[PDB]
Structure 1
Amino acid sequence: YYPPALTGLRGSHPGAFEVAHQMGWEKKTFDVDHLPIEEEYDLVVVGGGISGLAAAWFYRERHPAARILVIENHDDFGGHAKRNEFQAGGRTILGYGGSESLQSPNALYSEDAKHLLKRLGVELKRFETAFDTDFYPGLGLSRAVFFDKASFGVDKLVSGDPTPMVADEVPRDRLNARSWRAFIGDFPLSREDREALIALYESPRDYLAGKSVEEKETYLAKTSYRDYLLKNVGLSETSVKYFQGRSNAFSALGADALPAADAYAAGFPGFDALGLPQPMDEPYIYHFPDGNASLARLMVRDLIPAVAPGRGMEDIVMARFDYSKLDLAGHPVRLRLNSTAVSVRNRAGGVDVGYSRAGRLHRVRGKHCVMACYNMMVPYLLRDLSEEQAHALSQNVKFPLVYTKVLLRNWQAWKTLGIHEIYAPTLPYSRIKLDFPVDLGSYRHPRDPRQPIGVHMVYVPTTPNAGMDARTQARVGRSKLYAMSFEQLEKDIRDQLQAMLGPAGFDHRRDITGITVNRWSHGYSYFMNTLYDDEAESEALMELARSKVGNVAIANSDAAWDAYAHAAIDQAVRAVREL
């Protein structure tokens, strides 16, 4: 039993969601109050992502003798933080299934989050040498933009992209980029379109001239980035398609759904002459080879020492995890996989929890409970919620995303084209890249273009320019993914890689040796969007949603309306203190 070596349809895989949807879609209830209580714990945690694991860890720090049960519906622990493995050339190649890197941790990680990192042996400075920052730039590789036939008349890859991005691992002086005029000059757009794009960068003007600074901020909060480019900068409908998908990977929405103020904060072009006040700079290098799955693995090994030997950040990378040790009776911490919580109820100074596993209901009991699952799931579980609080929890509509890992036999085609990363403005996969090169522990990142390498590509099922709000794009994105077979997902992967790399000799039937699709149908937590949400009413809803209910506290990154691992930790810490 070893989920990380499984390929194919992963993420929220078949088997993980069916009981959840029986509750969510069919409104079936699974009451367990006529079943005998089978086990008792000090703490029961619903949900085995980073938030739930942190809740267990901080609970145990406060109560060293505590008996803790973690209930998790997927076949692996970690929630969005998942380890993916490939076997190639007799060596393991690691990928991350979801939760990707520690985001600007020097600036954003709270005291408690840094305390967890220290106790687990994670030294942030180690990544200043573990991350091979100059590997790809030193090979002369650059980022590129792929324009597709269907939207631009021709397939064309344009390299040398100088576009600075929010979470950038490449030092600016090492982008191997070209001037805006040279770069944009190769775009397969009309001469007029190209000269307006170049002017955007070479001749910024105050597109909101006359307005005060406060009026500009108000306008930009209620205007989408796409409408600002269209109505105020004056770009054509064809020119703005270049910007449609740029924000998909980081925000799970396109330029039609992001306020122009948020594009400004993320360094998008078009604001340089508006006279706006100061708001991206921390190097994006805090990346284990399996992403933030290493954080989950570090906590699990620390909470359940029998699952794996070693201590510290180095030996976790290749540590062998024995999943049969996760849920042993008598062990004070038990992690119960493949299990959907269906009921949570305060009773007699404690909490009764029902869960379903392999089609059968079970009842356990805790002194305390932390609900670290998707917040939208809580109203279907927590029988004590007021109607007001249940409605608030349901307002956190999460964003769907797909992280796909592809094993290439070699990456000579990437070398030939001079690229390590591609942006595709109007294709399903908007970001395709050679994986981050990290050496940590005994793991060595692939180096030889003649030999296998992992590729990472992000697909966000947006519905741009439709007049939808963000919650509706998210829901509709999930219906689209629900309609797609694995075979359909694989055809998109293969078709796009063939069209982008094919001119340099790539043959997808021969050069792809592995595919892992991490389908995160419920991905990023919702976040307050000033195009569609009132800030004061959103703050109130968020605060109400996560209010403690007896001895049941609410966590997950969802509870912060903030899709980050440090939010997951901070929300768990708040949940544990409330108990």
Structure 2
Amino acid sequence: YYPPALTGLRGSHPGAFEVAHQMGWEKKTFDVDHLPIEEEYDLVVVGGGISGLAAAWFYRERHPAARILVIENHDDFGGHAKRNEFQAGGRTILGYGGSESLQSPNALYSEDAKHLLKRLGVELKRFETAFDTDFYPGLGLSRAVFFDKASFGVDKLVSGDPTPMVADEVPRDRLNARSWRAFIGDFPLSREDREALIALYESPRDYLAGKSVEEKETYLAKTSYRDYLLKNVGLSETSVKYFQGRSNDFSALGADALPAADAYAAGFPGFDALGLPQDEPYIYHFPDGNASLARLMVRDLIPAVAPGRGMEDIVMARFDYSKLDLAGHPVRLRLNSTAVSVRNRAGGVDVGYSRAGRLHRVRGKHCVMACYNMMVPYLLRDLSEEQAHALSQNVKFPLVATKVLLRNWQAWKTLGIHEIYAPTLPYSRIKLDFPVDLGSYRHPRDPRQPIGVHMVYVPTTPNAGMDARTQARVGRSKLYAMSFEQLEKDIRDQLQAMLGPAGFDHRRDITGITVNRWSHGYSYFMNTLYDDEAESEALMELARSKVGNVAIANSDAAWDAYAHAAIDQAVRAVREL
């Protein structure tokens, strides 16, 4: 039994969500009060993502003899941080199912997070050599933009994109990019539109002239990036389509739901002459993404699942899932199990869960809710109406992270590219995977040999007048109506249209597809186009309040969709108990 080698429809896979939806959609209740208590623990963690695993880890650190149960509803631990695997040419090729890398860790990681890393044997400086930073640039490859015929009249791939991004693994001087005039000069847009885009870079103007800096900042917080471009910069509706999907990957929303002020902070163009006031290499990437963080914690917590120690041997270590949930062992991780009930009683907490359609009741002195926060009201019976409602307002964003095994990457080499941005297509981000050597694992190097592609699909509804919560809920409705066959068609259609001109043939050249469907992906985050900062902060703090011996974690609890928020919220929750 070995989930990482599965391909096909993954992420929140069939079997992971149905009991949860019986609660959330049908309002079915699954009470276990009339069942005997089957097992007893010092701590029961609901949810086996990075946050829940960290909670078990910091709790044992404080209580070394503690008996800990971790209940997780997917068929594998890690939550968004999942290991994907392909077999190709007698070797393993690794991919990340979701949680991608550690974000600017020297700048952003707390002392507690850094302590977790060090105890697990993660040396951040090791990625300076593990990440092969000059591999694709040294091969003369650049990033490209793919314009689709539906939106721009013709399919066109334009390379040499100089656009700097938030979390960039390419040193700025190794972009193999062209000037703005030459690059935009190739856009399939009217001469007028191309000249206006070029001028956006060559000759910025104070599009808000006459406002104080403060009024500019007020206006930009209340105005979408798309509207800023349309109404103040004066770009045409055809021009701004170029920008529509740029924010999809890092914020799970298009330019219509991105506050102009957030676009400024993320390095988007148009602000240089506004008079507004005033980088870490994005290389902290295990070959299976932050799934390595989850695996490192699982192995540290449950030594029987795999041998070794440290960041090197984790990469190819063989996990034996039969050792995760062994009786009498102090730490047990129970997969395929949906918690349905959490109730304070007699100085402890009773937790009911459903596994293979059967209800169960266990008991712990302490409980950490490390699951999706909007799930918590359906489980935690003691919530006041106020706090349950607060939890329910963390409306997470759906995303789809697709891994594609290719027979070779000659087509990419021919086209001179290692990454594509598509302004309006379902997949806005498509790239050859990061080249990382770690432990015994070596990144694919030969374009005649197989390689993994990473591509992100976000089911936004651009330009419709929806607030962010509604685009998220509607995006999940669209994902719920998509079969795996429809998902694969979209992958194959777009890969063929982008790579076909250089000899790509999707039926011949794709040898693997793994679709990680994160219907409940990024935590909600406060959006100044729709939310008030003080109200939202009050909701956040209320939602995560301690309930008896039940503490609440998940990255959701910080309204902050980051692995280090997952850790910090677990630490706060463990300290509360």
Q: TM-score, normalised by structure 1?
A: 1.00
Structure 2 SS opposite 1:414:
helix
Percent identity of equivalent pairs? 100
d(CA) in 1 for partners of 2:485, 2:111: 45
Cα shift readout 1:315-374 (whole Å, capped 9, x = no counterpart): 000000000000000100000000000000000010000000000000000000000000
Measured after TM superposition, the shift of residue 144 of structure 1 is: 0.2
d(CA) in 2 for partners of 1:95, 1:53: 21
Structure 2 SS opposite 1:314:
coil
Match of 1:141 in 2: 141
Cα shift readout 1:367-404 (whole Å, capped 9, x = no counterpart): 00000000000000000000000000000000000000
Match of 2:87 in 1: 87
Structure 2 SS opposite 1:316:
coil
Match of 2:124 in 1: 124
Measured after TM superposition, the shift of residue 299 of structure 1 is: 0.2
d(CA) in 2 for partners of 1:91, 1:497: 24
Match of 2:454 in 1: 456
Match of 1:376 in 2: 374
d(CA) in 2 for partners of 1:177, 1:258: 26
Cα shift readout 1:385-431 (whole Å, capped 9, x = no counterpart): 00000000000000000000000000000000000000000100000
d(CA) in 2 for partners of 1:560, 1:539: 9
Measured after TM superposition, the shift of residue 442 of structure 1 is: 0.2
Match of 2:31 in 1: 31
d(CA) in 2 for partners of 1:20, 1:421: 37
Measured after TM superposition, the shift of residue 89 of structure 1 is: 0.0
Cα shift readout 1:240-293 (whole Å, capped 9, x = no counterpart): 000000000010000000100000000000000000011xx0000000000000
Q: What are structure 2's unaligned runs of at least 5 residues?
A: none
Structure 2 SS opposite 1:200:
helix
d(CA) in 2 for partners of 1:493, 1:61: 44
d(CA) in 2 for partners of 1:578, 1:173: 47
Structure 1 SS opposite 2:443:
coil
Cα shift readout 1:471-504 (whole Å, capped 9, x = no counterpart): 0000000000000000000000000000000000
Cα shift readout 1:424-482 (whole Å, capped 9, x = no counterpart): 00100000000000000000000000000000000000000000000000000000000
Structure 2 SS opposite 1:315:
coil
1:168 aligns with 2:168: yes
1:244 aligns with 2:248: no
Measured after TM superposition, the shift of residue 110 of structure 1 is: 0.1
Measured after TM superposition, the shift of residue 234 of structure 1 is: 0.3
Measured after TM superposition, the shift of residue 306 of structure 1 is: 0.2
Measured after TM superposition, the shift of residue 235 of structure 1 is: 0.0
d(CA) in 2 for partners of 1:250, 1:510: 32
d(CA) in 2 for partners of 1:137, 1:536: 44
Measured after TM superposition, the shift of residue 193 of structure 1 is: 0.1
Runs of 4+ in 1 over 6 A off after TM superposition: none
* Partner residue of 1:365 out of 358, 363, 366: 363
Structure 1 SS opposite 2:325:
coil
Cα shift readout 1:91-139 (whole Å, capped 9, x = no counterpart): 0000000000000000000000000000000000000000000000000
d(CA) in 2 for partners of 1:135, 1:120: 28
Q: What are structure 1's unaligned runs of at least 5 residues?
A: none
d(CA) in 2 for partners of 1:331, 1:408: 42
Measured after TM superposition, the shift of residue 49 of structure 1 is: 0.1
Structure 2 SS opposite 1:406:
strand
Cα shift readout 1:524-578 (whole Å, capped 9, x = no counterpart): 0000000000110000000000000000000000000000000000000000000
d(CA) in 1 for partners of 2:418, 2:541: 42
d(CA) in 2 for partners of 1:154, 1:267: 28
d(CA) in 2 for partners of 1:350, 1:148: 58
Measured after TM superposition, the shift of residue 58 of structure 1 is: 0.2
Measured after TM superposition, the shift of residue 166 of structure 1 is: 0.4
d(CA) in 1 for partners of 2:358, 2:424: 45
Structure 2 SS opposite 1:42:
strand
1:73 aligns with 2:68: no
d(CA) in 2 for partners of 1:246, 1:536: 28
d(CA) in 1 for partners of 2:309, 2:390: 41
d(CA) in 1 for partners of 2:197, 2:358: 60
Measured after TM superposition, the shift of residue 44 of structure 1 is: 0.1
d(CA) in 1 for partners of 2:514, 2:262: 32
Structure 2 SS opposite 1:405:
strand
Measured after TM superposition, the shift of residue 38 of structure 1 is: 0.3
Structure 2 SS opposite 1:273:
coil
Measured after TM superposition, the shift of residue 76 of structure 1 is: 0.1
Cα shift readout 1:6-33 (whole Å, capped 9, x = no counterpart): 0000000000000000000000000000
d(CA) in 2 for partners of 1:323, 1:221: 48
Cα shift readout 1:186-220 (whole Å, capped 9, x = no counterpart): 00000000000000000000000000000000000
Match of 2:532 in 1: 534
